[PDB]
Design a protein around this ligand. Structure first.
Ligand SMILES: [Ca+2]
Ligand SMILES: [Zn+2]
Ligand SMILES: [Zn+2]
Ligand SMILES: [Zn+2]
Length: 314
């Protein structure tokens, strides 16, 4: 088995994101040191087997740090990641991956993110494919990653500043496994909007592995509200995610099209009921054939399958 680790620094917090192919994970341990010597690293956290992200806010400004993540199997196997530090090739813009998994090895890719653009291109297109360990540059997020057919997995991807959006589901099932997505007010792409855009129908967007949002965001997922040839049903399944920053709302479902958002394991910084609203119901429309409407935040309804127990203060 193997584990690949990536690091992203945000607001004096070091965020770690990793992917692992170990199938029987029991626990995961985070190690840190002030030097590159792995023999001197010391454990700073013991985590459950499901998360794929971690945040370290206990560092001093005058030091550099090295991190490693040890994925421990039920049978004592130590699957240790590469080291990452704060100390100062198939994955290229426009690439399409089909029916296979591509490990980007932690490289960075990006093009641009022009102000006021009406159309931007995807950096990576997946067709029943998986991409893992990739960083999207702050100034070149363009239209993120597209799942254009079948089942796609976006595993341990870091968006330094989401441009139009982070990922788009134009396929059957798009799964986000871990990853860290940053957005900011006045950042690239304008006012923060959605992270995950969902256009296909009879399809699902899945969020797990403690996908983490940092900075300021519009919403985590939106079933297209006014797409050409709009309709549904569109589904969202959230089992583990964290918002360590601010967000306007979490999910937007078009209840008239049968959309259903099923949410639990959601942690939000300083969460208060209604701040932010989690699942909101809307009326979706076909472009040019009517106006959308917002009905409001809902709990335990047909289309908003989220209970108060599904969301908590981080
Ligand atoms: Ca942005
Ligand atoms: Zn987009
Ligand atoms: Zn797109
Ligand atoms: Zn596409």
């Amino acid at each position: 088995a193997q584990t690949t680790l990536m690091l992203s620094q945000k607001s004096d917090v070091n965020y770690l994101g990793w992917s692992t192919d170990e199938s029987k994970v029991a626990r995961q341990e985070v190690y840190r040191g002030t030097t590159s010597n792995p023999d001197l690293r010391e454990r700073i956290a013991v985590l459950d087997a499901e998360t794929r992200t971690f945040k370290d806010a206990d560092t001093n400004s005058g030091l550099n740090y090295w991190y490693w993540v040890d994925v421990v199997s039920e049978n004592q196997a130590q699957v240790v990641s590469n080291a990452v530090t704060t100390a100062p090739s198939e994955c290229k813009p426009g690439a399409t991956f089909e029916n296979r998994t591509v490990d980007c090895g932690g490289v960075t890719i990006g093009t641009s993110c022009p102000n006021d653009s009406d159309k931007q291109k995807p950096l990576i297109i997946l067709k029943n494919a998986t991409v893992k360990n990739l960083r999207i540059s702050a100034s070149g997020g363009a239209d993120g990653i597209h799942c254009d057919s079948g089942n796609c997995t976006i595993e341990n991807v870091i968006w330094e500043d989401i441009c139009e959006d982070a990922a788009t589901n134009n396929g059957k099932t798009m799964t986000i496994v871990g990853g860290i997505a940053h957005n900011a007010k006045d950042g690239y792409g304008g006012k923060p909007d959605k992270v995950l855009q969902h256009n296909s129908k009879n399809s699902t967007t899945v969020v797990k592995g403690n996908f983490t949002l940092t900075g300021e965001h519009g919403k985590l997922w939106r079933s297209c509200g006014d797409c050409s040839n709009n309709g549904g049903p569109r589904f969202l399944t959230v089992t583990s995610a964290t918002v360590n920053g601010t967000i306007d709302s979490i999910a937007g479902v078009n209840r008239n099209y049968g959309d259903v958002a099923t949410i639990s394991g959601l942690k939000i910084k300083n969460y208060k009921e209604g701040k932010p609203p989690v699942c909101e119901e809307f009326k979706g429309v076909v472009k040019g054939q009517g106006s959308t409407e917002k009905y409001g935040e809902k709990w335990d309804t047909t289309n908003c399958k989220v209970s108060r127990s599904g969301v908590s203060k981080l």
